[model samples]
Target chain A: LPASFDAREQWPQCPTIKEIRDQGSCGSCWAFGAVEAISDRICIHTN
Target chain B: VSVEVSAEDLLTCCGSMCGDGCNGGYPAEAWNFWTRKGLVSGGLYESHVGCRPYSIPPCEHHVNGSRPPCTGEGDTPKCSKICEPGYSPTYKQDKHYGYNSYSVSNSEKDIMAEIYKNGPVEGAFSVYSDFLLYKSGVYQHVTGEMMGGHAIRILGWGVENGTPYWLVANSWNTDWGDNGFFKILRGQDHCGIESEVVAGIPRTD
Candidate 1:
């Protein structure tokens, strides 16, 4: 964490977090959470 | 496991362990799927395009047999590798991402710190009908059926009009609710958003 942080506001570098994905009508939010978190972490770490 | 993990893959592959096809599933099970097995990444093929693919909830047929447009239903879409049964082909961008370790958050501050420090966290919450009409403002379930438990991404948190809300990334697409994101009453565990939350270490190495 930072002394204080806001991901969108801080305007950090372009992290590799993929764009928001739609699960359609399916209850795949869990899949999204998993993928979203993993993607962002990769982008954050790599960038 | 170098590509993005497919949600459909989890939707299908984890069917036995998680549950029936889109009817319902668990975030932990998803994390488990990533850790134990692995996930392949594939973009949503609502069309040969991008997010132009999902159907909003309250999805219904137009007239009697006088069908409407895109094949969108309110139920779990039939599990398919090529964007359900109705979608066309030309959709393939695959990769698998896995997780190493995961931490569970039992408090709001902890989750805030986690999201701020890390990225987004996966958390499940009770969904209500009114939640579908959410626009701009912190949301607190007012009245509606306890639809079901739905997992969502906690991107960040904010306060509006003395109301604290968790900034959430939803899967319904960018057209619905706060441009694919919504805010929920935070700290109070409203809808259990603060009760059960999890984030993991991506096995990027």
Candidate 2:
């Protein structure tokens, strides 16, 4: 990848890239934010 | 990222628990759960008939005055492990996918690479009320109340027009920003978005 990057411009966007998940009304953004990345990587790496 | 991770697994089941479930908590505290019990891949709230693979559904609006006077369904959905009638649940307690995490550098380049190479990095920033009104564009602190400690996923980086920005995924859902995503100023640690940007390494699927 180049120094300039956009995940969307990548492979139809790797399937690993998840759709937006809601944090509901909770401050769980901390959890959801981090996990989304981890979840995405696993999907991208294995699938 | 695409596949859902059960928030309830951390929300309710995280033994000691983190912050006040729906109230708020430390991002790192929630990650501690993944380090121990790992996570289960799931679907959206109400994805199945009256069932979502994961808990932590979208926040509902209470527009009308009182509940008795309203169509205001709240975001407080019950957290359950049960699957819908016809469908089965996918359960994995393994920690290989994500067993470790850490704080990332505040440097914009480092944060960008971390996200591009990894998946997404979580960040805490001050969210102004005007931010809640954000529809599009690379965001900068404009005006509004000081909403504190809001976490977000810094997905990637780009330069809009001439201003460099970091693309972020919010937990508020698609209707909020650029279909569930938004951009904040990059490089200069604008609004501390570059602070506490964190990532975790997970094994291959």
Candidate 3:
């Protein structure tokens, strides 16, 4: 690996990687992390 | 085309497969559920651009007054099969699935390669009280007691001064941390940030 890497710069075609979501007051970081990554992966593969 | 998978869908609909929802759930099981049950498009709270947008409003995680103040933990919302009224895509049409989901090795090289090649990955770690007050720079647990476990998205990595850190996206909105992202000590698995990482290939078909 290089000294630095940013997914947003690596895959500009996939915008979801740059997104930051709020779990609100809910303890759903589990769900937020999973879905956010999955969403980005889907976009990366398709794009 | 762009996509933002709904946390709300999984939180409410995945049932015991993902866990207890807002009360908390399993990150690994959430990935597994994506492969089996799939998820749908959803946007930020009140964005109304997807089948099921996040119903929870963004709140200020710290003293910053950019958003509403944190009011206490919220209950999980009920699962719904129907899309918001008048959305172009039906709940089924907006669905996205994963083809392969697996945990990443704890090795720094392995986790780096996964993100370098496939995109962001979910990482679980212990959050101490000090983490909630993070404002910027590479973060290391300097002082505070263990709060609980937390799940976040690891998007990239970089070395700050002499410190190597994993750039992570938190679920606490953009106002928290460094615009919703933070860098944590790498290589030594500080707070277990390098442990229990997970990622998957999306099913575009």
Please tell me which predicted candidate would have the highest TM-score against the true structure.
Answer: 3
lDDT of 2 by residue, B72-183 (tens): 2234345454544665443442223465778888888788777667666678888777786677898987788886777877767878878888888876666667777888
lDDT of 1 by residue, B17-114 (tens): 77665666667767777777665544455332221133333221111222233243345544444443433443433334555646666788898787
Clashing pairs in 1: B3-B95, B3-B96, B4-B41, B5-B40, B6-B40
lDDT tens string, model 3, B13-124? 9998777878888899999888988899888999996888999898888757768887767888899987898787689877878887899999999999999888899999
Candidate 2 residue B203 C-alpha distance from true site, Å: 2.9
Residue B112 CA displacement from its true place in model 1, Å? 1.1
Structural similarity to truth (TM-score) of each candidate: 0.75, 0.81, 0.97
Docking class of 3: high
- Find the candidate with the highest DockQ and give its number: 3
Q: List candidate 1 stretches off by more than 4 Å.
A: A1-5, A9-18, B1-4, B46-95
Native A-B interface contacts kept, per candidate: 0.55, 0.63, 0.91
Measured as a fraction from 0 to 1, the native contacts recovered by model 3 come to 0.91
Candidate closer to the true structure by lDDT (higher is better), 2 or 3: 3
Q: State residue B36's C-alpha deviation in candidate 3, in Å.
A: 0.5
